[PDB]
Amino acid sequence: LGTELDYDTFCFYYDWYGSEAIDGQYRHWAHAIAPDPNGGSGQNPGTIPGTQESIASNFYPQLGRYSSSDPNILTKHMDMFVMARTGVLALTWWNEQDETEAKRIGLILDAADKKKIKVCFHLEPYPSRNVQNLRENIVKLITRYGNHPAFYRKDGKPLFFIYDSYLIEPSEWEKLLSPGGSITIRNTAYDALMIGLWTSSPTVQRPFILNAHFDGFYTYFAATGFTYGSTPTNWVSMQKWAKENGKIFIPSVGPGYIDTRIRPWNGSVIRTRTDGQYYDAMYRKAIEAGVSAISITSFNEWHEGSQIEPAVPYTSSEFTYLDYENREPDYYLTRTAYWVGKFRESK
């Protein structure tokens, strides 16, 4: 029918939103404003309070200030994934070691399964992250969730995205990811496809990826040109290298970028949506590069303005939000479904 989910399409999902009613605070809708890293001492940038009128986004959710722990919101999000045809939810994971995290992960897996969506983990740079505790956490996630019917596998293997993987040396990665590594996961019950973050130029990234023994790489950033890896004109040659070296390239595409509510000094990273023309151009480049899998930045990183989740016009007494302009609130979901079809036609 040209409506089914694609299980080589990964959409980055954030589960950190809270409401007073469910979580005790409108978590993440309220957010600290980041100081300017180039702006000198004594900055008191303040905070966005997460009131109805003033949230930590330049856009405003159709679903309002929702809780990521609200089963009714999770249902709606799964229906949005179905509309987008995105078969894999790539869940931010911060190793919070708290019961509220554990509950939420189970709710997300349960809701996903009702719609045949799959879940993989996006392993964030949690405190003291290193290859030993990464191994222990991969073991824990596979043990806890691996038998859940919504847990993602590709040809029998779990898949993890590793954000800011460059913070760990290749010599450490090798211990986990080479078949001969001291603490290898290869050939164990806990083997997985490990997808590292390609940031800068090939002269740095090629040996990093090879020496770390990652299975593949992704680029994350929604803003074109933010890094070498997020410059789509590089994707054909990145894919060629990937193919020559047995690596899986999963370029990241997004619909725009703007984070100036939380990072007022970061305006040079703004990428305008232009009624969908930015998203079209980026998605087309990923497909043209001939890749096997695509990642989408993001479902709902509202702080960074990269979300495809529906947004609505809103003007409050405190802020005039951006919105999808000439497009309707669900436009980026249905345009994702368009591109997933083009991707499949290519595969």
Ligand X SMILES: OC[C@H]1C[C@H]2N[C@H]2[C@@H](O[C@H]2O[C@H](CO)[C@@H](O)[C@H](O)[C@H]2O)[C@@H]1O
Ligand Y SMILES: OC[C@H]1O[C@H](O[C@H]2[C@@H](O)[C@H](O)[C@@H](CO)O[C@@H]2O)[C@@H](O)[C@@H](O)[C@@H]1O
Judged by the rule CB under 6 A, the positions of this chain that interact with ligand Y are 164, 199, 221, 226-227, 266, 269, 304
* Residue with Cβ nearer ligand X (226 or 338): 226
Q: What distance in Å separates the CA atoms of residue 88 and residue 107, rounded to the nearest whole number?
A: 16
Number of C-beta neighbours around residue 220 at 10 A:
24
The item of ligand Y, ligand X, none sharing an interface with residue 124, based on CB under 5 to 8 Å by kind, is ligand X
Closest by CA to 24, choosing from 105, 100, 109, is 100
Cα distances (angstroms) measured from residue 297 to each of 8, 24, 49, 74, 213 = 15, 28, 25, 19, 25
**Cα gap 290→257, rounded to integer Å:** 25
Contacted entry of ligand Y, ligand X, none for residue 230, CB cut-off 5 to 8 Å set by kind: none
Residue 292 interacts, among ligand X, ligand Y, none and using kind-specific CB cut-offs from 5 to 8 Å, with none
CA 321, CA 312: separation in Å to the nearest integer?
Answer: 9
- Nearer of residues 287 and 299 to ligand X, judged by Cβ: 299
Decide whether 228 or 319 has the Cβ nearer to ligand Y: 228
Could you give the CA distance from residue 124 to residue 93 in angstroms, rounded to a whole number? Answer: 6
Q: Which amino acid is at 135?
A: R
Q: Which does 154 bind (CB under 5 to 8 A by kind): ligand X, ligand Y, none?
A: none
Q: Which CB sits closer to ligand Y, 8 or 304?
A: 304
Min. distance of Cβ 153 from ligand Y in angstroms?
Answer: 27
Q: Is 191 or 304 the residue whose CB approaches ligand Y more closely?
A: 304
**Considering the complex, what minimum distance in angstroms separates the CB of residue 116 from ligand Y?**
29
Q: 13 - beta bridge partners? A: 91
Shortest approach of ligand Y to residue 299 CB, angstroms? Answer: 14
How far apart CA 201 and CA 230 sit, in angstroms, is: 11
193: enclosing H helix or E strand: strand 193-197
Q: Which is nearer to ligand Y, 34 or 312 (CB)?
A: 34
Pairwise CA distance, residues 277 & 296, whole Å: 16
Residue 302 Cβ vs ligand Y, minimum distance, rounded to whole Å? 12
Write out the residues near ligand X by the rule CB under 6 A: 92, 122, 124, 163, 262, 301, 303-304
Helix axes of 277-288 and 331-346: crossing angle, nearest 10 degrees: 20
Question: For ligand X, which residue has the nearest CB?
Answer: 303
Beta carbon of residue 245, minimum distance to ligand Y (angstroms, whole number): 22
Of 117, 187, 174, which is closest to residue 151 (Cα–Cα)? 117
Spacing of C-alpha 334 from chain mean position: 19
199 binds, among ligand X, ligand Y, none (CB under 5 to 8 A by kind): ligand Y
Q: Whole-number minimum distance, CB 100 to ligand X, in Å? A: 16
Q: Determine the residue type at 296.
A: I
* Shortest distance, position 13 Cβ to ligand X, whole Å: 10
User: Which of ligand X, ligand Y, none sits in contact with 126, Cβ below 5 to 8 A by type?
Assistant: none
Please choose which of ligand Y, ligand X, none residue 266 contacts, taking the beta carbon within 5 to 8 angstroms, the exact cut-off set by kind: ligand Y
